[PDB]
Amino acid sequence: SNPNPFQTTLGTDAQWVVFAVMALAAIVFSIAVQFRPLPLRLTYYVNIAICTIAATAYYAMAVNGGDNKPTAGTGADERQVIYARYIDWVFTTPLLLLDLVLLTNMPATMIAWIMGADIAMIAFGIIGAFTVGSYKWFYFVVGCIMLAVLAWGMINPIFKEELQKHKEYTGAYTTLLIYLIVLWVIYPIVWGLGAGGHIIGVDVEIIAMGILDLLAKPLYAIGVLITVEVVYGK
Ligand SMILES: CCCCCCCC/C=C\CCCCCCCC(=O)OC[C@@H](O)CO
Ligand SMILES: CCCCCCCC/C=C\CCCCCCCC(=O)OC[C@@H](O)CO
Ligand SMILES: CCCCCCCC/C=C\CCCCCCCC(=O)OC[C@@H](O)CO
Ligand SMILES: *C/C=C(C)/C=C/C=C(C)/C=C/C1=C(C)CCCC1(C)C
Ligand SMILES: CCCCCCCCCCCCCCCC
Ligand SMILES: CCCCCCCCCCCCCC
Ligand SMILES: CCCCCCCCCCCC
Ligand SMILES: CCCCCCCCCCCC
Ligand SMILES: CCCCCCCCCC
Ligand SMILES: CCCCCCCCCC
């Protein structure tokens, strides 16, 4: 019955921890890229941007979440809406896809609709998060279809040779992309259980997405960075 529907100190403490890790990753990548040859630096900068944006969003959430506003719903169904995460995601999820797109020869037209589907997905999530009642699930389902669309586009360079830079990169591209898709599918499950269904509380959703964000941003970035270094060195 809409358990624990407001952020408490548990969720705030989790956000400060993720803030610290995101900030540290951004700093470490920023020092590291100074030592690396010019062809690799764009990939470092993309990941510095990702972790910096995420750190800023988690700073905002940790400073403000205890205000227990805004909310959606009334009476016993009222639940806090944490929306800073969506502002993070509309900038970082295109950059996370760009990490892999840079390993391919995708044409601009294809990059355009993959990135468009990604941005639409986030837009549907935040609209749904503020929607009271059953229409929230229309936004949710269309956002899920957008995830399927962007995933299909990202999968195509695996088996379309004309979309590949080198057959060499296919193993790492495939493995990194499967890791990404696995993690990204968990986000709508958390949303459906929390923001949508009010089945899990706000601190639980914060912790779940804090774990996902650490896996999907700095740990993923280390995998991408290792990949481009190994490929360039051979
Ligand atoms: C050009 C660089 C990329 C674009 C600029 C940075 C992108 C976004 C960065 C961080 C995420 C946005 C931070 C979110 C800022 C909103 C503050 C908030 O969450 O309010 C809490 C409530 O209590 C108030 O209603
Ligand atoms: C509502 C605000 C939305 C803000 C979205 C910000 C996203 C910006 C980041 C990325 C956008 C996509 C830019 C894509 C840049 C071109 C990709 C590229 O260079 O790869 C081409 C390959 O075929 C060869 O390597
Ligand atoms: C490819 C690897 C995939 C990794 C999957 C990562 C899964 C992360 C998502 C969920 C993990 C569960 C952790 C979330 C555990 C929440 C429990 C909690 O914080 O209790 C606080 C009280 O409010 C409870 O009432
Ligand atoms: C660093 C942050 C990441 C990788 C966040 C990824 C978020 C998603 C894949 C969100 C997906 C959603 C849907 C598929 C449907 C609508 C609700 C969302 C926004 C949670
Ligand atoms: C190929 C894209 C697949 C799209 C799958 C969408 C699944 C969404 C789950 C539906 C959850 C709605 C629950 C409604 C609660 C009343
Ligand atoms: C409450 C404890 C939650 C722990 C969840 C941690 C998930 C770890 C998944 C790691 C898989 C990715 C390889 C590093
Ligand atoms: C205040 C910063 C001191 C320098 C830390 C980064 C070192 C960059 C040197 C790389 C040149 C090859
Ligand atoms: C392709 C993405 C599928 C996401 C499905 C999530 C369904 C779990 C939500 C639970 C709502 C009660
Ligand atoms: C090249 C690294 C860019 C890092 C900054 C990205 C934007 C930060 C927004 C707070
Ligand atoms: C780069 C740091 C990656 C951290 C992964 C954390 C997994 C969740 C542990 C609670």
From TrEMBL:
<keyword id="KW-0472">Membrane</keyword>
<feature type="transmembrane region" description="Helical">
    <location>
        <begin position="82"/>
        <end position="103"/>
    </location>
</feature>
<dbReference type="GO" id="GO:0005783">
    <property type="term" value="C:endoplasmic reticulum"/>
</dbReference>
<feature type="transmembrane region" description="Helical">
    <location>
        <begin position="42"/>
        <end position="62"/>
    </location>
</feature>
<keyword id="KW-0716">Sensory transduction</keyword>
<feature type="transmembrane region" description="Helical">
    <location>
        <begin position="14"/>
        <end position="35"/>
    </location>
</feature>
<keyword id="KW-0812">Transmembrane</keyword>
<feature type="transmembrane region" description="Helical">
    <location>
        <begin position="137"/>
        <end position="155"/>
    </location>
</feature>
<keyword id="KW-0675">Receptor</keyword>
<dbReference type="GO" id="GO:0007602">
    <property type="term" value="P:phototransduction"/>
</dbReference>
<keyword id="KW-0600">Photoreceptor protein</keyword>
<comment type="similarity">
    <text>Belongs to the archaeal/bacterial/fungal opsin family.</text>
</comment>
<feature type="transmembrane region" description="Helical">
    <location>
        <begin position="176"/>
        <end position="200"/>
    </location>
</feature>
<keyword id="KW-0681">Retinal protein</keyword>
<keyword id="KW-0157">Chromophore</keyword>
<feature type="transmembrane region" description="Helical">
    <location>
        <begin position="206"/>
        <end position="232"/>
    </location>
</feature>
<keyword id="KW-1133">Transmembrane helix</keyword>
<dbReference type="GO" id="GO:0005216">
    <property type="term" value="F:monoatomic ion channel activity"/>
</dbReference>
<dbReference type="GO" id="GO:0009881">
    <property type="term" value="F:photoreceptor activity"/>
</dbReference>
<dbReference type="InterPro" id="IPR018229">
    <property type="entry name" value="Rhodopsin_retinal_BS"/>
</dbReference>
<protein>
    <submittedName>
        <fullName>Rhodopsin I</fullName>
    </submittedName>
</protein>
<dbReference type="GO" id="GO:0005886">
    <property type="term" value="C:plasma membrane"/>
</dbReference>
<feature type="transmembrane region" description="Helical">
    <location>
        <begin position="110"/>
        <end position="131"/>
    </location>
</feature>
<dbReference type="Pfam" id="PF01036">
    <property type="entry name" value="Bac_rhodopsin"/>
</dbReference>
<dbReference type="InterPro" id="IPR001425">
    <property type="entry name" value="Arc/bac/fun_rhodopsins"/>
</dbReference>
